[PDB]
Amino acid sequence: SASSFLDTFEGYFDQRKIVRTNAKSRHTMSMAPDVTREEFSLVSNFFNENFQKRPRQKLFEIQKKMFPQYWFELTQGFSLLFYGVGSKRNFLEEFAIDYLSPKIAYSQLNSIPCLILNGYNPSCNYRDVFKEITDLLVPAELTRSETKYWGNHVILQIQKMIDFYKNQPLDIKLILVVHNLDGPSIRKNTFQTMLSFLSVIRQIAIVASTDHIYAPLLWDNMKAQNYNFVFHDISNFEPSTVESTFQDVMK
């Protein structure tokens, strides 16, 4: 850019200048090479499994030494929100399955069940997620007085769960691994209300990930208070092979 500033509001105002019509290039993808789906996939997995794999493995071995600190934060009622550059899918599965569930199961004497939401899926739906939560936790059904007048039964059920679990012993019964809390269907307000109200309950551990740069805009004071986040930057430059297949790539 023919600019004097790059960073801050100075760079924002200096790089948004009115470029003339004659200065604009007319280049398109018609002068770009054509690639097929299969060679794209082939070069993709070869670069994902060989370009800087050894520094990524060293860095992943570095971040694994923070797992007891994550467990200690989860025992005090904080929800983990992991952010960074690159995919955090394998990190969240490995921490929540290989480490967190056996440590929690041994610390309170089967392992603790881990429910994994995939928010990179657009078809992640809060009613079916609450159906499996009901299956795992077996809460008491709402009475007729509690149903109100065409009220949302999921939210009223969770409020019943909140003032039931306030008296229970503080033993973690469910681990909730939310991949991509900022994904296209999970970022909507009803799903976020559902998950923050589930984050109120001490007996559920919440491990979440975000990918968008504007993700803290999802949470107001009520939602940030209910979520009770401790933030952790675990940037690894992971390629995100799983999440990339839910968008149309070659277009």
């Binding site: 600019s3 200096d14 948004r16 296209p184 909507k188 504007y214 805009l217 107001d220």
Partner: protein
């Protein structure tokens, strides 16, 4: 109130109440129109304050009683804790709504140019109509964060400008929750969509009182443009 006032200090009381009603009508008929309910409410609001100004000298002199209670007949009197980040975000959103983005570099840019570069010249002609009389315009998030960073209050390892951390975004989310700022979409809002644009949702008097609470000169930003 009248029966306690006459022992604290029937046709005469009738003339007192009737003269009060006629004075209320002549003071506020332009304000109420020919509205029985509004004038009844004004009579109910102003009768005890009128009775409290009645002395032994005022009963047989309606003029002296009228000058004794002049402030009741001059104004209608029918009426009834935000964070610093929230206040400056509201001020920046008002600026982003009511100032065109082509001229922002001619107001907020203050850095030293290592690289040869020409700042903006600024607007040439004033507007004819005050743009704060019209409905607000829509803006993007990064423009609002730019103006918020430019107007917020403040060496080798300091970087005294405040960057957009999670408390700023939390304050912005609360500001949207209270409807002090608004979006193009009202229900089932994709906050993270680039297509979603934001506008201020407060009037000028509210942002004026807010700017007076933090000693920010917001009227200086609109004085030179119309």
């Amino acid at each position: 109130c009248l029966r306690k006032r006459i022992i604290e200090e029937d046709d005469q009381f009738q003339n007192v109440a009737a003269n009060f009603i006629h004075l209320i009508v002549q003071a506020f008929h332009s304000y109420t129109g020919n509205d029985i309910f509004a004038l009844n409410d004004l009579i109910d609001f102003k009768w005890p304050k009128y009775v409290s100004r009645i002395t032994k000298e005022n009963i047989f002199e309606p003029l002296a009683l009228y000058k004794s209670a002049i402030k009741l007949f001059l104004s209608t009197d029918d009426n009834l804790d935000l964070s610093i980040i929230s206040k400056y975000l509201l001020i920046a959103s008002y600026i982003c709504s009511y100032l065109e983005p082509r001229y922002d570099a001619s107001i907020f840019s203050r850095k030293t140019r290592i690289i040869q570069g020409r700042a903006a010249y600024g607007r040439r002609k004033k507007k004819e109509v005050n743009p704060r009389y019209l409905q607000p315009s829509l803006f993007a998030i990064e423009r609002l964060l730019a103006i918020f960073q430019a107007i917020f209050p403040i060496a080798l390892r300091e970087e005294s400008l405040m960057k957009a951390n999670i408390e700023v975004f939390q304050n912005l989310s609360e500001l949207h929750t209270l409807k002090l700022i608004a979006t193009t979409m009202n229900k089932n809002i994709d906050y993270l969509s680039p297509k979603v644009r934001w506008k201020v949702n407060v009037p000028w008097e509210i942002i004026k009182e807010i700017s007076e609470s933090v000693h920010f000169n917001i009227s200086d930003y609109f004085s030179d443009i119309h």
